[PDB]
Amino acid sequence: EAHLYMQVQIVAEDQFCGHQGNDMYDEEKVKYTVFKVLKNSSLAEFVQSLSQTMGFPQDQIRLWPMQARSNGTKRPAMLDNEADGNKTMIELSDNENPWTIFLETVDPELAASGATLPKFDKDHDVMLFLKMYDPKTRSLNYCGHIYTPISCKIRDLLPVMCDRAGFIQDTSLILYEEVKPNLTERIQDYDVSLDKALDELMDGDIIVFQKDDPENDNSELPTAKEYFRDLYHRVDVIFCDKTIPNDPGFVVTLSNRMNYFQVAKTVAQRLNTDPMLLQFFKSQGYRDGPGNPLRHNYEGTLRDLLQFFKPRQPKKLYYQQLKMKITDFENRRSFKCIWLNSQFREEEITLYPDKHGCVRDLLEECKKAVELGEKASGKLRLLEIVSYKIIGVHQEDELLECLSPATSRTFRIEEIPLDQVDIDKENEMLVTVAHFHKEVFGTFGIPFLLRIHQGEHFREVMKRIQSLLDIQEKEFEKFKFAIVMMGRHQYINEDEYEVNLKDFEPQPGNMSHPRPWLGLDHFN
């Protein structure tokens, strides 16, 4: 017969002291006295049972059923012990369980002296709750409750309030009504009755008061209004690093009314880093994990970042620490290129320079990224290659935004070889060399620049070629060597040693149109 009982949770006034939040107390930080009670038991029987169990006379206690209001507050309401004493609790609660009730008793140290429970006229009396706001400590002090006639004037309660809060008498007080969270209304007229002063006056309403003192203007929350406002917007956010797997993160308390700059500064403070060295990620929010990245210029507030979390769920925010300032990190350009090492071998690399930078900065990143020659120059350069042909060299001052966005364009970075810096101008000539299978249109391989002397022993040039290529030896034999000019090609007899500059330069004074080049035929 468990379904015929209900938990009645009794809360005492000692739980009201110390509460720093809205209404009287925090629902979590409260000790109840739970009673398993028969639904058909009368109210009078339960009042007798309570008075006997906790050790007070039944006429020394008052029962204040805890009732929720339309505004979302939860305040004590009136129950008539005599008239309603015989009705069952299950009909009185209107199908509620657990049913919390405030139990108002006389102070046993003020009751041993002979005082008893004051009488209360339901029609003409009211129960006021009194709180004291201290701006210096920014805190609330529960100052008990009072019975007072509805028609009584506030001014007659002022001395009571003063000496009930420990104030010197005739102290000027600023009075507010806490209507609900985010609604604190100042009481402008002290000469009006409670009925007139408080619209829709009920039992359980809370009036907050503070000293009227210039010193209050030194506090960051001089009055209870801004205090209750800041409390309304405070929220605890759990920040987690996306790199650390299942990082539990750390919790910081902030205000919803906050932009990106303040959040970033705060997190940077609690992380001992520069705010610019942090990138933040909004949560996915149905699943737990990093979502859309946030830009540095985001003009939204904290509520927007947390809006798809339920108020019960822990509100998480992902982030990662950066090695570069957030602006340059958001302006980085994915730059895929090829790195040429000391061994003349191609490597695929991806660099992230700032979009508004020059070639120098790209080469500097690549230098930080790679290793240089054993004792080579230590200076790098940027080639632009399309269709396996070098179409240009980029000067280190060139802007990164003018670089050939086409997919056919390959950017190479390479160390200048030792044997091409200073050559003999009227003797040695640098010739462009490329491969091709069968005809000369189907070119392939890695083209290169090769030095050529004057009247020179062609098998020296082919052992130089071999020094570059360096494959197994006896596929070299199938190389067919030809001299190509404007599409025509004449093959060169390898053992005849026919070499002289005249067969490699264009017509007199000719640059603009293709210069003669050396062609190699083989199969890849």
């Binding site: 909004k282 996915q284 149905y286 979502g291 859309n292 990245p293 985001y298 003009e299 269709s387 997919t407």
Partner: protein, 1027 residues
Amino acid sequence: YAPIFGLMQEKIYISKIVVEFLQSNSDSTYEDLINKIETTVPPSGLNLNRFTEDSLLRHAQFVVEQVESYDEAGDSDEQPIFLTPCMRDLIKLAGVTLGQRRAQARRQRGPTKATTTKLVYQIFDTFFAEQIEKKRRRCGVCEVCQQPEACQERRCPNMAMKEADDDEEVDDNIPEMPSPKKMHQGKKKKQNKNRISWVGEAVKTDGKKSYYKKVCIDAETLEVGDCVSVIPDDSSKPLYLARVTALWEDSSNGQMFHAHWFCAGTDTVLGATSDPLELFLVDECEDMQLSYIHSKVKVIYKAPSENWAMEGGMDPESLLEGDDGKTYFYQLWYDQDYARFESPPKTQPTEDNKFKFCVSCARLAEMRQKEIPRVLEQLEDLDSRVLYYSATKNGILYRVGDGVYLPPEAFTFNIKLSSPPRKEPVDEDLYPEHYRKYSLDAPEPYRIGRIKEIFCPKKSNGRPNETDIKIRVNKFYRPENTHKSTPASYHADINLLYWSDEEAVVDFKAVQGRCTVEYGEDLPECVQVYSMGGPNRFYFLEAYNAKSKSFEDPPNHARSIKLPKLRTLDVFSGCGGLSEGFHQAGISDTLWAIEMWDPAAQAFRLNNPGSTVFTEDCNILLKLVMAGETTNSRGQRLPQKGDVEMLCGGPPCQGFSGMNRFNSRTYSKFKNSLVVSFLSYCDYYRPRFFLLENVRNFVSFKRSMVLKLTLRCLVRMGYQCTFGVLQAGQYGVAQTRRRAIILAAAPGEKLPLFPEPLHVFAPRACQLSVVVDDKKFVSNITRLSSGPFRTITVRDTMSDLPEVRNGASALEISYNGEPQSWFQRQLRGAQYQPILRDHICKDMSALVAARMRHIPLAPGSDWRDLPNIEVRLSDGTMARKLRYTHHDRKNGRSSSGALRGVCSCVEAGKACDPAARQFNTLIPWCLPHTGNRHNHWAGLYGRLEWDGFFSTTVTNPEPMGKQGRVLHPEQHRVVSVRECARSQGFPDTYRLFGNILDKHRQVGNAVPPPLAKAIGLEIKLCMLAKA
């Protein structure tokens, strides 16, 4: 000579491609021609890479001569093949002269029939009698004009092109033609009758000079409610007809009576199309003496049948019984101002007004009482002003504490508001085309305020003055209007407002409407639900102070059914944007839809899982449901009579695209077009609601003939109709595209209104008026160049999309960014971890890619800012600079004295010089070639402004096409498929199908769902009213 032979082979091949493609269809646009050229596979024998736009531009002369030679041999009544719009645009770009040589070949499916029902067929055949009744002389300078024998071989192609332009241009878009005046306002002739006598006693004794009688004798018995013909003064107008709504004797004047006029069908928009025996009610009545009575005529109120939903498809001759067409008859109230056809008003006379009631008098009285701004309740009194608690105007009730609109000039802010260069003349060598650049704006939205009090000024006698009402308003600073200026409104919510403390005073007549302005914390739900809940809902979070230019918390004193969804048939849905808009309205569930095009059908299937889509012509299914079948050839269950509830769609107008007066061939095509089939569908199925949509020109097609005939057919059907045009951009879209809308309601329903504009827009594209038979028709829209919400700009449509380059084809990409604009927030959704889809733009030619890579990023920049620099290309070919070999008189020479002309045609009366052309040039040759004749082609190769809007609908973006600017503001790419869909307003979750071209076409064709929702809300307002 190998390159020349290869070029000749390319010319022959492109001529074959163009001629066969023109055989395939005669309605393709320039972009479709481009697509056909590039997609064509080059032959194996000839060594060439692929056809590009340069190939067509350089073989234009040969391809055009071949195209005209094909059509010059066999001449028929069919339109010649070189007047296809794409080919005409190609002529308009490249200066090709027509009519030379030709005849070089050396001696070398059905009209169909739409399945119209009997009544629709009857209406069309009925008007067919009147279509048979029946400047820009030949140029004389072309070779064709000079040839001896108008003659079929002497047809001037130039004059044909000019006539095509005249048929395309609107003739004419004059403002006025003032609004039509009152009918019967002229005097009427007095009739000499023998004897006039009352019968019986005075029925009603009002106590004044008026004594109401029943029966009058003018050699014939006349009673109240009978119909009388009248002969007015002969002013080329036919006899008038009116019902004697009241007969009474006046002690002051002679024998008096009130006549409520009818209106003939010819006097309405219907004109000649209307049945001569048909009439309509109208809100025009007047007092007159019975001496002007001519004779008695009998009319009958042809009420719709009680089984009107089941009358579709039956033979009209079976229902023609009886005594028809013999006498006059009326069925629909008519309002000429808005061109509205309604069911007759069901106003019921009171008992004291049985025998003097006039529906026209009652309507005029209620209208004049409605327009008068009248204050309602007194609240408090002062020595100078008297206070009131509420007021009303135009059928709307305002109270103290309601958000209120105000015209932009109503009041001014305390902020200083707007606080007020020239570049040096650029190098004519680097920039040889800058000189051609040179040598209204959308208003600020409605001011919004909150009433503090309503009061009136006491007169000299002390009595309150109710002629005017003065209203005190607390102003709501929009994010734009605060000191942070317009950039403060790039990110903020479209609703968002700021509370202030400054007070303004306005006249009550200035108030233009009520909007609910509310707090954002006292809201019982999240602000998103409040914003999407209903119209004109604005929410303010925190107050703004102007003196300190700061943001504070608002002062405390500033704080405060579902009908079943209709089964829907969507004819010619396309991708289903209309259906999605209707679903957003939550009034319609599409259960069936028709679409011939396969990708559109697949897109609708993906977007609408619970719907049936038929991939066949609508005529086949219509004939099938006439014949009584239930399953099609594929077994799909076709809907039967009574299943469909709302019928919506928009048909193409390709077969009758002209504007000139009707022709026998044009009508022979039009009678079996798709619009007649749509009307037959509406006839048979008898929907509750009927929506027709098309392009703006559809209003003035064939001199408004299509609109008039459709309206006549619908009126014969017994529906209630209205029509107008709507500017899509006014309803939350960054596009200018006017759309003509025809609304229809079943008998007994309520005719929907046209939705009021929401977003302020540029007045240059707000011309919603319509001209028909030299009469001006304006829809019921009451907002002109104003509204609550700001414009929707292209920045608030594409800003946060991740950067992609030309040729990008990654269907699935990360967003890599949170939404930044309100429109984007509404488009994305409430769940945030998607994969953004279809963010793909066309992969164009490398030369064009470099061209648009070199265009500057300054706003409005176009081809006129193109530098003449030799630049390398992706394929490895060479792009030579543009050489000026001639001099033009109209423009003069450069400041450096360099030549400005490009061809011999710059000199007056000089033929274009062959081999003087250039190609594969970074700056185009055709643009400087023909700038002067087409206003410098200003805007071509231009970039969309970050603050502007799309020029027009985008079906296939292309830099040199007629769709206006198609370039992304910053990235070197054209607008992508997702970007095009973002323009129309499609939600990001919406799915598409097919390749990139098909996706672009489906995005372009569909109605913007924000427009469809805007219509969808209005229809629901009528569904709710009935129940």
